[PDB]
Amino acid sequence: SVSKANVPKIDVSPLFGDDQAAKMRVAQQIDAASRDTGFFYAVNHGINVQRLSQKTKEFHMSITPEEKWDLAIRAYNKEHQDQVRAGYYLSIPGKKAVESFCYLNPNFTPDHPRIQAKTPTHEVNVWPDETKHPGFQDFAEQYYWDVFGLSSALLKGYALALGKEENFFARHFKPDDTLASVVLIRYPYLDPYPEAAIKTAADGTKLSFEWHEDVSLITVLYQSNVQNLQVETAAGYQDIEADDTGYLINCGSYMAHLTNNYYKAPIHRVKWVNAERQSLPFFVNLGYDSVIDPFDPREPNGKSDREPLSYGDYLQNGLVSLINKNGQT
Numbered sequence: 001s002v003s004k005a006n007v008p009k010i011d012v013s014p015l016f017g018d019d020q021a022a023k024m025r026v027a028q029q030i031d032a033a034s035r036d037t038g039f040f041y042a043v044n045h046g047i048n049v050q051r052l053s054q055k056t057k058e059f060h061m062s063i064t065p066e067e068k069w070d071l072a073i074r075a076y077n078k079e080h081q082d083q084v085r086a087g088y089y090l091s092i093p094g095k096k097a098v099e100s101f102c103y104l105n106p107n108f109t110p111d112h113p114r115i116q117a118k119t120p121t122h123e124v125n126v127w128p129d130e131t132k133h134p135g136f137q138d139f140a141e142q143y144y145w146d147v148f149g150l151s152s153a154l155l156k157g158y159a160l161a162l163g164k165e166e167n168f169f170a171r172h173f174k175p176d177d178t179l180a181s182v183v184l185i186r187y188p189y190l191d192p193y194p195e196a197a198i199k200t201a202a203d204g205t206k207l208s209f210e211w212h213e214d215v216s217l218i219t220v221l222y223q224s225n226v227q228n229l230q231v232e233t234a235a236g237y238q239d240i241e242a243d244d245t246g247y248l249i250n251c252g253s254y255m256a257h258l259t260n261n262y263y264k265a266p267i268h269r270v271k272w273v274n275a276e277r278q279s280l281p282f283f284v285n286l287g288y289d290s291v292i293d294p295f296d297p298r299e300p301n302g303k304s305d306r307e308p309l310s311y312g313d314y315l316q317n318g319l320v321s322l323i324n325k326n327g328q329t
């Protein structure tokens with residue numbers, strides 16, 4: 001068998017308040033988890049995840065094939081050349097099992113300055129018809145702001161953990177320009193499950209998605225209570241237990257770059273499981289021009305031999321590279 005990964009449950013409620021000492025004790029826990037397996041569960045986070053799962057299930061089980069083509073990204077529908085990130089990512093029965101819907105900042109409207117300039121990685125969200133999916137757009141936009149609020153609190157914890165002031169990351173994570181995305185992923189139960197939709201790791205483990213590091217500053221994930229994720233540690237790939245009451249948090253490769261690998265972006269993968277389940281990540285991305293000067297918390301002067309990288313440059317290059325490595329989702 002595979003050993004259980006050490007994934008501590010951290011009560012992050014002090015990060016929403018004004019007790020500075022309490023916030024430092026949470027930051028220490030984040031530091032420990034970031035230096036160990038790289039994963040932790042944020043608990044006492046204040047978000048109604050049962051309602052999120054219910055609203056997402058109502059959407060996934062009622063959307064029709066017609067609506068999926070009408071909302072599809074350009075990888076599936078050549079008529080939609082402006083949709084690279086936002087929209088519907090179709091399944092391919094007999095070949096690709098997963099399907100999903102991605103949306104970006106609700107403030108990316110037609111009049112937004114970055115939308116007017118046609119700056120890469122910024123798009124105006126696409127939504128299904130209101131009469132067919134009553135309340136879905138409003139729920140989904142409010143969810144973006146609820147998880148943005150949790151993510152801002154978590155970024156204060158990471159900043160304190162690295163010896164910085166609490167707004168070190170959060171000052172670059174703003175409602176008017178964040179490149180953060182929500183993905184509503186559906187993994188289906190299929191009988192017979194297409195072998196073409198199952199990948200096989202070098203160690204023989206059946207997978208739905210291969211090893212990778214995330215393209216994010218941090219990733220804030222809600223998933224159904226079905227075990228599936230694995231993390232590579234020095235002692236091999238270990239199973240991350242499921243917890244559908246908490247948010248699973250890990251660092252992405254932008255955090256590894258900024259900290260000179262002090263907080264590594266953990267390598268992880270998704271096991272194949274024949275179960276109807278949900279995976280709802282929020283990728284915490286900064287603004288297009290956000291540049292944080294790289295540093296090293298293990299060195300006395302804190303200097304690093306890494307060059308500054310704008311978040312926009314990092315993101316555009318990273319999303320393409322992940323598709324090339326592990327396939328179009």
Ligand SMILES: CC(C)[C@@H](OC(=O)[C@@H](NC(=O)CCC[C@H](N)C(=O)O)C(=O)S)C(=O)O
Nearest residue numbers: 085102181183185209214270279281283329
């Ligand atoms: C994190 C979860 C485990 C989940 O995995 C993902 O969402 C997969 N991310 C990407 O494809 C990047 C998607 C980027 C998105 N289109 C965007 O423009 O911002 C990762 O495995 S990370 C899953 O499969 O359960």
Ligand SMILES: [Fe+2]
Nearest residue numbers: 212213214268
């Ligand atoms: Fe990931």
